[PDB]
Design a protein around this ligand. Sequence first.
Ligand code: HAS
Ligand code: HEM
Ligand code: CUA
Ligand SMILES: [Cu+]
Lengths: 166, 557, 33
Amino acid sequence: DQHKAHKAILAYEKGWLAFSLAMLFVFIALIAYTLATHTAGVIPAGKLERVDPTTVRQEGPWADPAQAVVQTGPNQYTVYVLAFAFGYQPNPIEVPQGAEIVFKITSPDVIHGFHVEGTNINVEVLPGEVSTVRYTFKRPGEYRIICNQYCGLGHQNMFGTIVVKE
Amino acid sequence: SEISRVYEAYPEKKATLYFLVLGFLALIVGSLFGPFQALNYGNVDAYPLLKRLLPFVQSYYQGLTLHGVLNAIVFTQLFAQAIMVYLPARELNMRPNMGLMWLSWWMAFIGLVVAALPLLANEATVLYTFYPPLKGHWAFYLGASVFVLSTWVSIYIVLDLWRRWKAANPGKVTPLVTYMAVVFWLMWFLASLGLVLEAVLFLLPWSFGLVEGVDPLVARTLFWWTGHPIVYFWLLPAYAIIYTILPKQAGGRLVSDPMARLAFLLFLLLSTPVGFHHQFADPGIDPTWKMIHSVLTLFVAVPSLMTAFTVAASLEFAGRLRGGRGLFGWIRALPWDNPAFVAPVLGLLGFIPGGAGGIVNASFTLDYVVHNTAWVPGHFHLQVASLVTLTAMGSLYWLLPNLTGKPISDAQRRLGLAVVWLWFLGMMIMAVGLHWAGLLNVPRRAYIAQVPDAYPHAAVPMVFNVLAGIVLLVALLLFIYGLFSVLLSRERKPELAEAPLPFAEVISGPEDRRLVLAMDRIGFWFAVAAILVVLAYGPTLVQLFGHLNPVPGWRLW
Amino acid sequence: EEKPKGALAVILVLTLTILVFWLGVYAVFFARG
Ligand code: HAS
Ligand code: HEM
Ligand code: CUA
Ligand SMILES: [Cu+]
């Protein structure tokens, strides 16, 4: 007991670093896997794509919610989504099923969140920057957009809709 | 002058006592919003009630700001200034410089006072992360700045103690508690660079009217430079208490001094270069850098997995010594009738799922499942409001006697144990509901009681949230009564306060001194720490500071 | 004495909690991917 059992403790400690490290690496591995597949398109684009918040809903690709979905390949569509003090334009976003959807989201005011219930889409929207995420919806139906970043008194009420067509 | 001659042989008790009292006062007020918020996540609106008790409260989100700023920033910082100055001072029997210590306290008081004014005036309802371009009163940023900056005076105070003690003992190894304190204050110095740079460059000139706006991506990247390590600044005081005090109150020894040193050394290295894990969902920050900060984040949990075994085995050793018998004999041999001991051990239990949730959160792509849902508060209430707070509540039992004199009566020990078990139990119950409402996509930071039809899939973990609101309301109230009662009840008594804290004897072996020697090259490791920071934030900040996109400020409350 | 059995059982609980939580959310991720 004790000192004799001190040798045991600094040795069991060695096994536990050994084991902790191996399980942490298996996680690193299983993340890696998600990084190499379709699921990875929810990661925001690296590049800085700057815009001007005070202009963004008057001039440019965000100023007309009618013109928010553009077909940008045979099976690809781009959607200019504006997240604003207390809703989303367009409402609804109307996207086909099976298509790569490329969201380009910005704000004219403060930070908002864009969390699409039932998907991994979960990006912060920053006034002056463009959040670009990619996703393919495999199931038609409605998907509520939640704003999950406090933005003011109307926050708990900021929701949107994706309608992805049968 | 003092007939409590205390504060002229050890006046470092006088300062410490002010740090703790003010910190526990912040906890009480900040926490008063707690149960209201728990019932909100329970789909019961109770702000019509609160607004009539506290007529100054304009909204749920003013509540959440005050709750956040007052609990997570202010109580915790003050608990850290107290513990991490006074424990190393006592281990070394030296006096902290008192002109500076009274300054640090004054800088923190002037700070809280100044920040608190616009918060109660509803002029800075921007949450404790104050994300631009939400714009607070200038007095909130200047308050938080001076309040934060009072930790620099504390860093000086401790390195000074260390310099002087080394001078008097050439070739002696830094004693354990002091070693902890030193890596800890050095780690906080690196850490705070970020939030300091966000204030001085951006936030302060913005809100005085000196520039029209701020880049939110940089403001948020500087913030999280400080924002992750700041949780380790909350945790390590408790870890300090847990490593060097708890085992003695438990009957035992710390089973390893190098182990504990190692843990702390590892927090100096890896606590700061990891804040991109709060930005998994930000634009304009390269996916590759997120993968680095993610691997590095998983490394910051290794010291903690070590603490788990090290603490566990110390408790086990104590337990056996106190007649504890089988696989699990040793748990009921621990002093369950002492709140000093119970509060941090319950904290540790809560810590098990709290840490497993952080690991999930840290795993980059897995953070898309849970980011900004109720799951996150689920996670941190298990960490800070449970372990860190409970180690502070339990402190009151062995530290307050030590500082004041006033001994704990049996009915005070008893109320202690009610509080601590109810606090623990309320937190576990709140954790489930918030973890579960999170996986059902309920957002954090929301007055969801105003949209009561909105999250119908969440009806049942919403009952859990109500249940806990009510438990934690009982416990907070039992605490307020208990805390005021430990201070107020007239026991202005002599002896038992002439006390060095119940520090632990430690087990020694042949493989101590070579490890301990290496880890004591503090200048070396701080440089490695500062190099890891540059290598982790540097590439990304160069790009951003070259591409500043200031945007107008908004007030949305 | 010999084996710090207790401590091991603690880190066992730890590990298992960690796995249940991590593998649990890893499945949620794919089911939403
Ligand atoms: C004081 C506070 C906190 C601690 C400590 C903490 C620990 C971790 N967290 Fe966290 N956290 C995250 C990852 C981690 C990781 C990897 C750890 C690790 O350090 C944890 C390692 C811990 C363990 C591996 C547990 C070890 C277990 C022990 C030590 C128990 C032993 C028990 C015994 C001995 C009892 C036995 C006794 C008997 C009697 C049986 C991530 C992701 O990377 C996010 C962002 C999520 C998002 O989307 O924003 C995050 C967000 C937060 C938020 C949000 C801030 C905001 O407003 O956005 C709060 C403030 C917070 C606080 C704290 N966090 N965390
Ligand atoms: C007193 C019992 C408590 C209860 C019932 C309680 C309840 C809650 C709930 C339900 C939330 C989530 C609300 C939301 O995100 O909208 C929350 C937020 C929070 N709590 Fe507590 N809490 C308590 C104590 C504490 C303590 C002691 C601390 C810190 C030491 C703490 C720190 C925080 C922080 C930092 C937030 C998030 C602030 C933000 O998102 O802006 N809580 N609390
Ligand atoms: Cu937009 Cu919350
Ligand atoms: Cu963090």
